[PDB]
Amino acid sequence: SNRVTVESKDIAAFNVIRYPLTTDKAMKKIEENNTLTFIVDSRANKTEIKKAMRKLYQVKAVKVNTLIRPDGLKKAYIRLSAAHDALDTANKIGLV
Amino acid sequence: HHMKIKDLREKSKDDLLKTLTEYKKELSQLRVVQQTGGAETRLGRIRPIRKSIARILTVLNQNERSNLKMFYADRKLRCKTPKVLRTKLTHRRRLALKENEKNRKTSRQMRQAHKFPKRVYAVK
Amino acid sequence: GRFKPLAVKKKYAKKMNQNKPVPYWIRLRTGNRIKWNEKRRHWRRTKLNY
Amino acid sequence: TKGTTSMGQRHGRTHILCRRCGRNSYHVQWERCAACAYPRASRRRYNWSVKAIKRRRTGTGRCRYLKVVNRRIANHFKTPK
RNA sequence: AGACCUGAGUGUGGCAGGACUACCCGCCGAACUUAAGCAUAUUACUCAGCGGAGGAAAAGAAAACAACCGUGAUUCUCU
RNA sequence: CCAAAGAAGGUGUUAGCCCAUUGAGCCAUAAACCUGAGCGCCUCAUGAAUAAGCGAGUAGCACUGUUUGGGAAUG
RNA sequence: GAUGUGGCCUGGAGGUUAGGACGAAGCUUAUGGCGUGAGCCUAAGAUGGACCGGCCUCUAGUGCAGAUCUUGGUUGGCGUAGCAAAGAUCUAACGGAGAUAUACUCAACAUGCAACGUUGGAUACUGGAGCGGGGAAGGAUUUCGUGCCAACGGCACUCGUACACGAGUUGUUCGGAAACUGAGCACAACGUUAUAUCGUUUUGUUAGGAAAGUGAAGGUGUGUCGGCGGAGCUGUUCGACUUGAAAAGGGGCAACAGAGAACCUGGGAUUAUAUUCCAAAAAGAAAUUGCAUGUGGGA
RNA sequence: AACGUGUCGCGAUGGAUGACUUGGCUUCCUAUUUCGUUGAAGAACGCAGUAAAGUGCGAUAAGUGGUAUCAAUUGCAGAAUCAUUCAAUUACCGAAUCUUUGAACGCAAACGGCGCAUGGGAGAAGCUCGUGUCAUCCCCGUGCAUGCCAUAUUCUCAGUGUCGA
Ligand SMILES: [K+]
Ligand SMILES: [K+]
Ligand SMILES: [K+]
Ligand SMILES: [K+]
Ligand SMILES: [Mg+2]
Ligand SMILES: [Mg+2]
Ligand SMILES: [Mg+2]
Ligand SMILES: [Mg+2]
Ligand SMILES: [Mg+2]
Ligand SMILES: [Mg+2]
Ligand SMILES: [Mg+2]
Ligand SMILES: [Mg+2]
Ligand SMILES: [Mg+2]
Ligand SMILES: [Mg+2]
Ligand SMILES: [Mg+2]
Ligand SMILES: [Mg+2]
Ligand SMILES: [Mg+2]
Ligand SMILES: [Mg+2]
Ligand SMILES: [Mg+2]
Ligand SMILES: [Mg+2]
Ligand SMILES: [Mg+2]
Ligand SMILES: [Mg+2]
Ligand SMILES: [Mg+2]
Ligand SMILES: [Mg+2]
Ligand SMILES: [Mg+2]
Ligand SMILES: [Mg+2]
Ligand SMILES: [Mg+2]
Ligand SMILES: [Mg+2]
Ligand SMILES: [Mg+2]
Ligand SMILES: [Mg+2]
Ligand SMILES: [Mg+2]
Ligand SMILES: [Mg+2]
Ligand SMILES: [Mg+2]
Ligand SMILES: [Mg+2]
Ligand SMILES: [Mg+2]
Ligand SMILES: [Mg+2]
Ligand SMILES: [Mg+2]
Ligand SMILES: [Mg+2]
Ligand SMILES: [Mg+2]
Ligand SMILES: [Mg+2]
Ligand SMILES: [Mg+2]
Ligand SMILES: [Mg+2]
Ligand SMILES: [Mg+2]
Ligand SMILES: [Mg+2]
Ligand SMILES: [Mg+2]
Ligand SMILES: [Mg+2]
Ligand SMILES: [Mg+2]
Ligand SMILES: [Mg+2]
Ligand SMILES: [Mg+2]
Ligand SMILES: [Mg+2]
Ligand SMILES: [Mg+2]
Ligand SMILES: [Mg+2]
Ligand SMILES: [Mg+2]
Ligand SMILES: [Mg+2]
Ligand SMILES: [Mg+2]
Ligand SMILES: [Mg+2]
Ligand SMILES: [Mg+2]
Ligand SMILES: [Mg+2]
Ligand SMILES: [Mg+2]
Ligand SMILES: [Mg+2]
Ligand SMILES: [Mg+2]
Ligand SMILES: [Mg+2]
Ligand SMILES: [Mg+2]
Ligand SMILES: [Mg+2]
Ligand code: NA
Ligand code: NA
Ligand code: NA
Ligand SMILES: [Zn+2]
Numbered sequence: 001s002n003r004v005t006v007e008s009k010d011i012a013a014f015n016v017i018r019y020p021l022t023t024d025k026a027m028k029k030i031e032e033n034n035t036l037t038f039i040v041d042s043r044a045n046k047t048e049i050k051k052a053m054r055k056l057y058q059v060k061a062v063k064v065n066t067l068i069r070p071d072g073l074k075k076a077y078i079r080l081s082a083a084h085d086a087l088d089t090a091n092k093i094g095l096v
Numbered sequence: 097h098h099m100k101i102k103d104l105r106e107k108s109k110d111d112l113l114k115t116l117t118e119y120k121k122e123l124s125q126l127r128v129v130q131q132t133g134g135a136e137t138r139l140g141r142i143r144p145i146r147k148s149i150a151r152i153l154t155v156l157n158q159n160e161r162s163n164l165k166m167f168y169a170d171r172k173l174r175c176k177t178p179k180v181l182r183t184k185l186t187h188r189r190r191l192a193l194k195e196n197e198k199n200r201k202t203s204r205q206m207r208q209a210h211k212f213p214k215r216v217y218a219v220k
Numbered sequence: 221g222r223f224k225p226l227a228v229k230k231k232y233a234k235k236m237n238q239n240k241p242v243p244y245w246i247r248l249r250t251g252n253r254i255k256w257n258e259k260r261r262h263w264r265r266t267k268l269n270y
Numbered sequence: 271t272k273g274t275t276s277m278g279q280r281h282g283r284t285h286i287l288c289r290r291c292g293r294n295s296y297h298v299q300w301e302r303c304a305a306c307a308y309p310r311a312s313r314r315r316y317n318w319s320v321k322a323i324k325r326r327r328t329g330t331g332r333c334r335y336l337k338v339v340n341r342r343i344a345n346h347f348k349t350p351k
Numbered sequence: 352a353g354a355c356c357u358g359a360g361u362g363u364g365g366c367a368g369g370a371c372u373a374c375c376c377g378c379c380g381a382a383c384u385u386a387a388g389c390a391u392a393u394u395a396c397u398c399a400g401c402g403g404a405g406g407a408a409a410a411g412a413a414a415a416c417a418a419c420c421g422u423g424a425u426u427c428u429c430u
Numbered sequence: 431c432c433a434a435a436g437a438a439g440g441u442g443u444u445a446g447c448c449c450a451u452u453g454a455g456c457c458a459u460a461a462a463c464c465u466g467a468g469c470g471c472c473u474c475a476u477g478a479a480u481a482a483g484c485g486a487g488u489a490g491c492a493c494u495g496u497u498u499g500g501g502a503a504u505g
Numbered sequence: 506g507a508u509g510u511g512g513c514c515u516g517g518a519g520g521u522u523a524g525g526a527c528g529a530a531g532c533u534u535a536u537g538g539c540g541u542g543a544g545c546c547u548a549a550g551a552u553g554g555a556c557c558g559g560c561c562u563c564u565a566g567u568g569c570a571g572a573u574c575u576u577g578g579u580u581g582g583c584g585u586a587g588c589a590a591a592g593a594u595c596u597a598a599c600g601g602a603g604a605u606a607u608a609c610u611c612a613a614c615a616u617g618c619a620a621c622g623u624u625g626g627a628u629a630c631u632g633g634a635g636c637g638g639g640g641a642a643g644g645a646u647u648u649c650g651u652g653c654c655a656a657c658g659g660c661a662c663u664c665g666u667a668c669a670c671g672a673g674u675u676g677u678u679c680g681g682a683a684a685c686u687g688a689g690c691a692c693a694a695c696g697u698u699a700u701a702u703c704g705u706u707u708u709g710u711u712a713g714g715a716a717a718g719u720g721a722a723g724g725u726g727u728g729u730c731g732g733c734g735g736a737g738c739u740g741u742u743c744g745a746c747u748u749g750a751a752a753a754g755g756g757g758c759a760a761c762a763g764a765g766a767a768c769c770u771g772g773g774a775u776u777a778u779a780u781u782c783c784a785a786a787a788a789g790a791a792a793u794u795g796c797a798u799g800u801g802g803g804a
Numbered sequence: 805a806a807c808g809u810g811u812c813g814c815g816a817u818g819g820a821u822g823a824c825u826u827g828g829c830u831u832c833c834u835a836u837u838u839c840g841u842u843g844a845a846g847a848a849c850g851c852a853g854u855a856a857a858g859u860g861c862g863a864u865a866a867g868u869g870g871u872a873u874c875a876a877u878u879g880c881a882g883a884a885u886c887a888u889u890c891a892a893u894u895a896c897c898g899a900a901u902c903u904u905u906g907a908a909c910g911c912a913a914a915c916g917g918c919g920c921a922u923g924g925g926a927g928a929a930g931c932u933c934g935u936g937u938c939a940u941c942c943c944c945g946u947g948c949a950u951g952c953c954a955u956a957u958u959c960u961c962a963g964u965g966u967c968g969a
Contacts, residue, residue, distance in 0.1 A: 001923085001946055002178045002842090004164055005901080006156040008113055009925065011120045012943085015863070019127040023672060025775080032774095033783075041863095043916075047942045051926060056124075060928065065675035065781075068226070070646065072233035072849085077675050081928095082784065094128045101869075102890050130853080139853040140882035144891085150864035150901085157900055158869075175364080179842045185347060186339065187840055191366085210477045214467075221641060222680075223761065225914045227904095228287070230849070232645055239646095240856045241669085248879040257856050263647060264666075269294065270287065270645080270914095281642060286914055290906060292847050298914075301690075301758090306846085310702065311369065311907055313846085318399060328371060328845050334862095334902085335844060341897080346836055348898045350870090351460050 016044045016052035020095045021075065034086045035079045036093075040066070042074040049076050057093070059084045097141075099148040104155045116152045119145055228270045235261065235268060291326075 018039045020026070026037035040049055046064045053061045065077040080086050090096060099119070104112065123145045129138050161181065168177040201209075224232075242257050261268075288296040288303040295305035306326075307314045315323060328336070 002180050003945060004160055004178065004180060006109075006113075006153070006160050007944085008116055009944095010113070010117045012925090014120045014124045017124075019124075019131050022132050025673070025777095028775090029782090035782095045942065048926090051942080054928085055926090062784080067675055067778095067781095068229070070233060070674075071237055072230050075675085077782085079784080082787095094125065095132050097884075098891070100890050134853090136853070136881060137883095142853065144883080146864085147868075147891090150868040153864045154868045154900060157864085161900075182842060184342075184842060186343070186838090187842085187844090188838085190842080206476070210475095213477090216467085221643080223641090223914090224645085226916055227848085228914070229645095230916080231287075234849070236646070238856055242856060243854075243879095245854075245879045246856090250879080252879085254857075259857060262667095263645060267644070269643090283643085283914095288847085289913085290847065296914090307702075308906090312702080313370085314702095315372095316399085326846070328839085331846050333845075336839060339839065339844095340837090343837070345897070346462070347460095349460050350898050 013052040013055040016041050016048055017056055020090075020093060022095050029077065030086045030090055033079065034082065034084075035077055036086050036090065038076045038078060040074050040076045042068065042072065044074065046076075049078065053078060057089055059089055098144045099151055101151055101155075104151060107155075109156070109159070112152055112156050116149065116156070119149045119152065123149065224270075231270050232268070 018041065021037040021039060023037075029035035029037060038049075044052075046066055049064050049066070050061045053059055060081045060083065061078050062081045063079040066074060067077075068074050080089065099115065104115075107115070123142065126138065126142050126145065129135075130142075164178075165181055168174060168181060238259070239261050240257070241260070242254055246252060246254055283298060285294055285304065286296050286298055287294050288306060288308055290303065290308040291306040293303070293305040296303045296308070302308065302310070305314065313326075317323075324330075
């Protein structure tokens, strides 16, 4: 192989999920829709966002909706399964 | 509360890789602090953590390249060395005649040089 | 309109992020020469045509 | 008539952004750039515009690698013992 | 059967393409202008155009000058 | 008062002596470079004490074209 | 038009001799004196704040009133020409600093005018080929909320497509691509050109042109079956692994209105998105691919 | 009268002049001084606690490492130590990193698109005893343009070419 750089497999999910959003719209979706809002890698995937959510937060996502914002960033609307509570994981994440 | 370069160099690959994960996780938690207000003491920790990740990766890549260099330094595997590990120099210098080839001589040229060597002399 | 290439959309995104005034603390630096952003853009004055 | 009224008859684009130089000189229909001649392998370079040559020559950009190799040459490719 | 001649396929190891281009090497190559007009001429074996190198390039070891009591690869300087 | 240092910058007015400069000298060095063609070892190379030919679609020449100070023709 | 001038002036150089924080250069003048003049010098600054004068010689990008001269600024015209197509606004209340804003005299008018936004009424216009509701091209945050009124919206604004801050664009089925061909393009190939940055390249179709790596059937092993006679054996069907029929004419782009294409209602679901969001009674009802498992039936 | 005119003192508008100069122009010199498929020049995105431009840098992103040097940087803030060093800051450079592209070269392209090989990774279906394994789907690495040269433990072939069996 012509590529010899060491790449860690346990840190890929940290690039996929960057940070949550705490806007007024984002907080509304947590309560009535069990949905978390995140800024994700702009080249990331809906399938890969689901896997990253499992690794980083040990929650199961039933649906991921993505959009590329007008400022160039990619935002993900992640609905967690009814087994998990979005408010509870939001407290664990630290956004409350 | 960062990583010092001295103790990173006596760690193994697994301990370095394990340490890299903890700092990546800590940085990701600090990104949440950036968005949701955040105390200014915590925001001052982002740069030290980011440099620690760079230090860990620097040691990992330095060790890997040095190891692969002596692995392919063997007699039989030298010709199969990846081009990323070969000496860079310059495109022209790599293709230029080496000193050994540039200095090649014919049999007649060698005999002439030995028969009539250049001398050292002076005039009174 | 609705259609644009993603590369065009990303160029317009960068122009949007650059269309900001100078932060106030910049003007308080020791050897500062910047008073206002001289490359401010308005959609009615100058066009980008991406 | 020609003039103000015909200015409103101008629709579409002749040129879009070029992948190689980003100059908005890529002829959409002819599929080539008026500024750098992309996708031709060699660029446009004419001595009747020395001013245009100086706008695009080496050193007008970043020289990300040329800076490094110049230092290596100036230091005779120094390597550790 | 096989050979060797010609020509293919693939594996293995390499090289070319682009940039720069002040100076240098090869080609291509105008006109304005001057001639108190203008066509040969001049501008000029120049500009523009197309190629190719290097720290220089090109040239270079006599199928050379001379006509002398002879000189002695190439390049450059005064003349 | 210094000067083998007057040297031209800085410092709140015009500075040899307020600061930095201005010299012998000291320390450290991938390779390369220079030095009884520096100096050892192994290996490998190496010096000294009878006739024949010599560059062919080449040189010439003719016509045309071009270039040259080169003119019954310089390339 | 020629020439002369111990003739004048400007920026620098080699010399010489001076001045300046007790104030250099520059600038200002009913500051006078000197010179025929170019100019020189002094005075004052209720100017300035750090350099600079004389004389000899040297030197040059060395003297401005005009070139429809160049650049910057200013200026009368001049509070002038005008700001007249698209019919139009009125009223009360609320909001706002934008008022009912006052020496004397004085009951109110004759001394704070004129102008704003919102809401309710009134009146009118657009009149479905609309100052209606959605899209393409083009634009790219103008969208939304809050705040704000220096500049800008040629009058005005408390308003704004202005400014500031903070938000907003959610798809298995919608459009595109994946994945069609068209007028066409021109990579490869070949040829040409001193030079490829030239030409050919859909009239079924590249190239003097060996451009197919795909594979019927077999043979040979494996897996799921079948039948026969005595869990195995022979033969056999069908999928996986290892002999070669026939398939001429390289690789690609070009349609967001042609071809193609599996979703459509309800919502109390937004400040701004929605056949894109809604979560167990999904408000819900479907349709479609790709894999699988089990059941039923064949092999 | 009023407009208007002239002079002087003081103001405004307007930015000349002088002094200042980390800039330009011109001349001269010194070199183990000359890029790129080991992917250049150029172009595009991004990166700071705070960061629009510019500068520097590349997901290790106003920088990692190593040598010196010796206490800062500085608008604010933050910061173990007040420092032999392991963490100040500068300077230099041997070790590294180096996103999308571009000669750009797997195929394309107003498409952050789509492949064929070969390595991996994650896999809540299914099988297995929450552990293993893992279909479809998804993510990442490397190879894969054309031409030419050399080569083949002496690789596989073609020709009513020339022979020979
Ligand atoms: K000539
Ligand atoms: K006189
Ligand atoms: K003017
Ligand atoms: K062509
Ligand atoms: Mg997505
Ligand atoms: Mg979407
Ligand atoms: Mg539109
Ligand atoms: Mg557009
Ligand atoms: Mg038209
Ligand atoms: Mg018409
Ligand atoms: Mg057209
Ligand atoms: Mg087209
Ligand atoms: Mg002329
Ligand atoms: Mg003439
Ligand atoms: Mg004439
Ligand atoms: Mg004439
Ligand atoms: Mg030329
Ligand atoms: Mg030389
Ligand atoms: Mg030579
Ligand atoms: Mg000679
Ligand atoms: Mg001084
Ligand atoms: Mg010294
Ligand atoms: Mg010796
Ligand atoms: Mg001869
Ligand atoms: Mg001949
Ligand atoms: Mg001639
Ligand atoms: Mg001739
Ligand atoms: Mg002739
Ligand atoms: Mg001058
Ligand atoms: Mg003097
Ligand atoms: Mg006066
Ligand atoms: Mg006067
Ligand atoms: Mg004088
Ligand atoms: Mg003049
Ligand atoms: Mg004047
Ligand atoms: Mg005039
Ligand atoms: Mg006026
Ligand atoms: Mg009027
Ligand atoms: Mg009018
Ligand atoms: Mg009207
Ligand atoms: Mg009303
Ligand atoms: Mg009143
Ligand atoms: Mg009133
Ligand atoms: Mg009507
Ligand atoms: Mg009507
Ligand atoms: Mg009607
Ligand atoms: Mg309408
Ligand atoms: Mg609005
Ligand atoms: Mg107005
Ligand atoms: Mg705005
Ligand atoms: Mg904003
Ligand atoms: Mg034809
Ligand atoms: Mg066609
Ligand atoms: Mg074709
Ligand atoms: Mg044909
Ligand atoms: Mg197409
Ligand atoms: Mg369209
Ligand atoms: Mg259609
Ligand atoms: Mg569709
Ligand atoms: Mg809307
Ligand atoms: Mg690269
Ligand atoms: Mg490509
Ligand atoms: Mg290509
Ligand atoms: Mg034969
Ligand atoms: Na333009
Ligand atoms: Na030495
Ligand atoms: Na009027
Ligand atoms: Zn271009």
